[PDB]
């Protein structure tokens with residue numbers, strides 16, 4: 349019966365990626381530190397990317413119990429950041445010799461009293477802190493057509509975010525004839541591909557619909573958005589672009605989605621993958637400033653919301669050194685900003701100047717990376733080439749030993765860049781006035797430090813075909 353201590357020097361609210369990175373950082377710099385993670389979920393801290401990717405590519409019926417997945421290179425890894433025995437119990441935390449990290453699982457912080465340096469849990473427990481990190485992440489947006497459809501439809505809609513969602517949806521995948529994914533972004537498309545692969549064996553149907561002309565249409569320019577839609581269609585998924593959902597109802601036991609254009613889609617289950625809402629409930633009681641335009645808790649350069657409260661990960665609205673106020677949903681960001689928060693809580697006093705990278709794999713054969721401002725409404729220049737046999741996530745994993753792309757790319761920008769004297773890979777430059785403000789890499793790995801350097805420098809480029817040569821495109 350894990351009992352909450354009355355006081356902890358370091359209190360981390362939320363037990364996700366950013367919390368874990370902070371906990372690691374605090375203990376590295378203060379080897380006797382006493383750190384408590386308070387986590388709403390019943391599980392110990394775990395990474396999210398495998399939930400839409402490697403966990404679905406497995407013959408092992410046992411993997412939904414163990415959550416020990418095989419990477420694209422065949423090697424097993426646990427979804428948990430560390431073995432459960434590396435944590436100490438919450439009750440031992442205040443006086444165990446040499447300190448430790450405890451996690452109170454199944455407990456939610458429902459009140460933050462910043463002037464009293466205290467939080468209240470859902471069970472009424474009160475805990476004081478010396479330093480606090482808010483790392484509450486986000487909650488999935490629902491579709492208003494689902495929200496207004498009643499309990500029956502809502503009960504047959506998954507918002508895909510946690511271990512529990514993976515297990516429920518994997519079970520649904522084996523039991524029903526038709527599943528529809530609403531949303532064309534990277535998560536929607538990853539699940540389309542995962543579900544489509546399962547459906548081929550089973551002889552069942554997977555549909556993906558969304559309002560854009562093609563997959564990832566808000567990010568990717570037409571050529572690659574269209575190319576991705578073709579790749580998902582090659583997995584056996586019925587992809588419906590230009591689809592605006594008017595309503596969803598139940599008809600003769602099936603869900604019936606009505607689209608504005610007049611088409612109607614019958615299906616057994618819906619997965620909504622339509623973005624995230626930063627979890628800022630605590631800002632009310634806390635009196636903490638939130639950003640109305642981008643969402644999230646506002647923080648300064650050191651990730652502080654208050655002299656002794658920091659924010660990291662998806663819940664933070666930070667000042668991007670290039671782009672201004674910003675919020676992101678990037679594993680890399682959660683790790684680096686968590687880590688930095690931990691350092692600043694142990695006296696580093698350093699600013700968040702990192703340029704956060706994103707990646708997505710649609711299976712072992714197709715991958716993407718992105719950095720900076722990537723928006724398909726911006727002017728773009730794409731340079732493409734035929735793929736070599738090494739230009740895919742599987743080969744990147746083989747080479748690096750990891751499927752967590754942000755781990756293998758490193759965090760740094762290249763020290764210098766010197767341009768040297770059908771398509772299946774390329775680089776997309778997003779432009780403002782000949783300056784590169786964002787880059788998408790399609791099946792190009794180990795070049796993120798070059799992309800970070802190009803954006804950081806912020807020079808004008810006369811010829812992006814020359815710059816593409818840095819990405820081994822020519």
Ligand SMILES: Cc1cc2nc3c(=O)[nH]c(=O)nc-3n(C[C@H](O)[C@H](O)[C@H](O)COP(=O)(O)OP(=O)(O)OC[C@H]3O[C@@H](n4cnc5c(N)ncnc54)[C@H](O)[C@@H]3O)c2cc1C
Nearest residue numbers: 362364365366388396397457484485661662677678679682
């Ligand atoms: C399925 C999936 C696939 C993804 N794939 C990729 C990828 O391939 N590449 C990439 O760059 N990014 C990916 N992401 C994004 C990345 O995983 C997130 O950016 C990252 O998890 C953010 O970490 P975090 O610590 O900010 O938030 P989270 O990991 O969401 O953790 C916040 C935790 O705090 C808990 N919590 C919230 N409020 C409270 C409270 N009041 N009290 C107690 N606990 C609370 C929440 O339940 C949650 O467990 C993926 C996300 C998902 C869901």
